Amino acid sequence: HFADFVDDRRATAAGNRPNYIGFRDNFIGMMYYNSGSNTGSFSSQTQQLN
Amino acid sequence: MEVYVPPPRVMAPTEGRNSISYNPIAPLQDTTHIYIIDNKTSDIENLNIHK
């Protein structure tokens, strides 16, 4: 990007800030834990109770 | 000479057969009433954020 700009000729440049984007540690936030809104279930069949 | 000793009564038990149970207050050996209102659903969060 530009770090100082006056004219199209005279201007200094500096590289953009390093922005590492990846997943979380232990893949936190992939899955809805602690929710009544989005509650996953491990329910048995025939006795359907969660 | 044959004195009738009456049985002491039981005072039928709490936490019994028909007992709606909530822990700090006393339970009810009766029927009760619960409500599902839309006034509450307010000041509780993570359940309706745009719903």
Tab-separated table of C-alpha atoms in Angstrom:
chain	number	residue	atom	x	y	z
A	1	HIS	CA	0.000	0.000	0.000
A	2	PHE	CA	0.992	3.657	0.254
A	3	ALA	CA	2.682	4.831	3.434
A	4	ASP	CA	3.042	8.407	2.163
A	5	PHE	CA	1.556	9.829	-1.034
A	6	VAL	CA	2.091	13.295	-2.520
A	7	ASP	CA	2.329	12.890	-6.312
A	8	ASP	CA	2.224	9.843	-8.598
A	9	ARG	CA	6.016	10.027	-8.902
A	10	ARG	CA	7.156	10.640	-5.330
A	11	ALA	CA	5.526	8.168	-2.919
A	12	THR	CA	6.893	5.531	-0.592
A	13	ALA	CA	5.511	2.014	-0.433
A	14	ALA	CA	5.219	-0.522	2.347
A	15	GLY	CA	3.948	-4.079	2.235
A	16	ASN	CA	0.636	-4.922	3.830
A	17	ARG	CA	0.521	-6.245	7.373
A	18	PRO	CA	0.763	-10.060	7.624
A	19	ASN	CA	-2.713	-11.453	8.282
A	20	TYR	CA	-2.646	-15.194	8.935
A	21	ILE	CA	-6.175	-16.583	8.564
A	22	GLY	CA	-6.793	-20.190	9.556
A	23	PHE	CA	-8.974	-22.325	11.800
A	24	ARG	CA	-8.899	-22.123	15.580
A	25	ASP	CA	-6.923	-24.190	18.033
A	26	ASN	CA	-8.724	-27.562	18.425
A	27	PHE	CA	-11.292	-26.353	15.823
A	28	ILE	CA	-13.189	-24.212	18.314
A	29	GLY	CA	-16.243	-22.538	16.838
A	30	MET	CA	-16.858	-25.136	14.153
A	31	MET	CA	-19.683	-26.615	16.211
A	32	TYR	CA	-22.638	-25.302	18.212
A	33	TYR	CA	-21.914	-26.094	21.831
A	34	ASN	CA	-23.863	-24.543	24.730
A	35	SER	CA	-27.086	-23.877	22.885
A	36	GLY	CA	-30.799	-24.255	23.304
A	37	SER	CA	-31.134	-22.742	19.846
A	38	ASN	CA	-28.857	-25.144	17.952
A	39	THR	CA	-28.745	-28.266	20.105
A	40	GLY	CA	-27.339	-31.392	18.548
A	41	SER	CA	-28.680	-34.709	19.755
A	42	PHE	CA	-27.424	-38.198	20.492
A	43	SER	CA	-30.787	-39.901	20.903
A	44	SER	CA	-31.493	-43.595	20.698
A	45	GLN	CA	-34.026	-44.935	18.245
A	46	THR	CA	-37.144	-46.594	19.755
A	47	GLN	CA	-37.037	-44.549	22.944
A	48	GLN	CA	-36.417	-41.353	20.870
A	49	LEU	CA	-35.421	-39.339	24.008
A	50	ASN	CA	-32.542	-36.881	23.676
B	1	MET	CA	-59.583	-51.892	81.193
B	2	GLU	CA	-59.423	-51.917	77.366
B	3	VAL	CA	-58.427	-48.304	76.743
B	4	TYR	CA	-58.713	-47.444	73.046
B	5	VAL	CA	-55.345	-46.072	71.908
B	6	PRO	CA	-55.992	-44.324	68.561
B	7	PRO	CA	-53.428	-44.519	65.746
B	8	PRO	CA	-51.359	-41.357	65.206
B	9	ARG	CA	-52.063	-40.009	61.727
B	10	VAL	CA	-49.412	-39.842	59.064
B	11	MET	CA	-49.637	-36.355	57.448
B	12	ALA	CA	-49.355	-37.782	53.885
B	13	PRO	CA	-45.883	-37.188	52.494
B	14	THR	CA	-44.451	-34.262	50.573
B	15	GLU	CA	-42.397	-34.944	47.415
B	16	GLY	CA	-45.103	-37.541	46.861
B	17	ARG	CA	-46.876	-39.142	43.934
B	18	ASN	CA	-48.307	-35.956	42.355
B	19	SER	CA	-45.606	-33.428	43.210
B	20	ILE	CA	-44.577	-30.580	40.944
B	21	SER	CA	-41.072	-30.046	42.296
B	22	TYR	CA	-39.020	-26.855	42.491
B	23	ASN	CA	-36.069	-26.903	44.854
B	24	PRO	CA	-36.060	-23.785	47.126
B	25	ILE	CA	-39.818	-23.200	47.445
B	26	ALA	CA	-42.276	-25.802	48.693
B	27	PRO	CA	-43.722	-28.275	46.157
B	28	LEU	CA	-47.388	-28.687	45.247
B	29	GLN	CA	-49.474	-31.812	45.871
B	30	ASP	CA	-51.995	-30.520	43.339
B	31	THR	CA	-52.342	-29.340	39.787
B	32	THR	CA	-50.634	-26.075	38.881
B	33	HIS	CA	-50.348	-23.607	36.001
B	34	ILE	CA	-47.333	-22.711	33.886
B	35	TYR	CA	-47.253	-20.121	31.125
B	36	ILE	CA	-45.437	-19.607	27.836
B	37	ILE	CA	-45.639	-15.843	27.302
B	38	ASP	CA	-43.932	-13.613	24.753
B	39	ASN	CA	-43.267	-10.835	27.267
B	40	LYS	CA	-40.488	-13.016	28.577
B	41	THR	CA	-38.187	-14.203	25.820
B	42	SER	CA	-36.953	-10.748	26.712
B	43	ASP	CA	-33.761	-10.260	28.788
B	44	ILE	CA	-32.810	-13.875	27.973
B	45	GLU	CA	-30.193	-14.041	25.230
B	46	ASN	CA	-28.669	-16.698	22.885
B	47	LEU	CA	-32.161	-18.054	22.238
B	48	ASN	CA	-33.650	-15.368	19.987
B	49	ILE	CA	-31.208	-12.911	18.447
B	50	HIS	CA	-33.330	-12.260	15.371
B	51	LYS	CA	-36.429	-14.452	15.647
